[PDB]
Design an enzyme around this catalytic site. Structure first.
Site, PDB file in Angstrom:
ATOM      1  N   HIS A  48       0.783  -1.268   0.068  1.00  0.00           N
ATOM      2  CA  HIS A  48      -0.004   0.054   0.007  1.00  0.00           C
ATOM      3  C   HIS A  48       0.830   1.348   0.001  1.00  0.00           C
ATOM      4  O   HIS A  48       0.550   2.319  -0.750  1.00  0.00           O
ATOM      5  CB  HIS A  48      -0.877   0.033   1.274  1.00  0.00           C
ATOM      6  CG  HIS A  48      -1.893   1.199   1.329  1.00  0.00           C
ATOM      7  ND1 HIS A  48      -1.738   2.222   1.973  1.00  0.00           N
ATOM      8  CD2 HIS A  48      -2.958   1.411   0.639  1.00  0.00           C
ATOM      9  CE1 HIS A  48      -2.747   3.024   1.986  1.00  0.00           C
ATOM     10  NE2 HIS A  48      -3.444   2.657   0.994  1.00  0.00           N
ATOM     11  N   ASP A  99      -6.071   1.853  -2.200  1.00  0.00           N
ATOM     12  CA  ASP A  99      -6.787   1.399  -0.882  1.00  0.00           C
ATOM     13  C   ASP A  99      -7.679   0.286  -0.903  1.00  0.00           C
ATOM     14  O   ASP A  99      -7.873  -0.711  -0.002  1.00  0.00           O
ATOM     15  CB  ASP A  99      -7.919   2.524  -0.416  1.00  0.00           C
ATOM     16  CG  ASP A  99      -7.087   4.052   0.026  1.00  0.00           C
ATOM     17  OD1 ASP A  99      -5.765   3.994   0.080  1.00  0.00           O
ATOM     18  OD2 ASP A  99      -7.567   4.972   0.269  1.00  0.00           O
TER      19      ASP A  99
END
Ligand SMILES: [Ca+2]
Ligand SMILES: [Cl-]
Length: 123
Positions: A48, A99
């Site tokens: 991420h 996300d």
């Protein structure tokens, strides 16, 4: 934005308060990150982090003075499924995908309380 990411994680993991459970975990779950991921969840966070770094380098993202955590995008949760909106512009769409991927990743790996609030000496 962080507010959306929080919602995405809850979408995939209904019993969690993401900003608490997934903050300050391992070497990468939280602000910044460095070192070798301690487990698969930490690796989800490293990915991420890498996704956000790639985003900031995109021409479309350099136009807004808002960082990925403050940049609002549009998405929906339905039947515990995350959908990034077609109304999102290039930068917002890329961040939304980052996300969504992380939220899904979080929901598919083990959670080791031993790594919560990890001594940064291990990173
Ligand atoms: Ca180190
Ligand atoms: Cl999904």
């Amino acid at each position: 934005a962080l507010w959306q990411f929080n919602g995405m994680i809850k979408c995939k993991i209904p019993s969690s308060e993401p900003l608490l459970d997934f903050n300050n975990y391992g070497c990468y779950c939280g602000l910044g990150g460095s070192g070798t991921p301690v487990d698969d969840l930490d690796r989800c966070c490293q990915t991420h982090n890498n996704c956000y770094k790639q985003a900031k380098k995109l021409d479309s993202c350099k136009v807004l003075v808002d960082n990925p955590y403050t940049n609002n995008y549009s998405y929906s949760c339905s039947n515990n499924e995350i959908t990034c909106s077609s109304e999102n512009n290039a930068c917002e769409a890329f961040i939304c995908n980052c996300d969504r991927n992380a939220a899904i990743c979080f929901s598919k790996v083990p959670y080791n309380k031993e790594h919560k609030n990890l001594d940064k000496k291990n990173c």
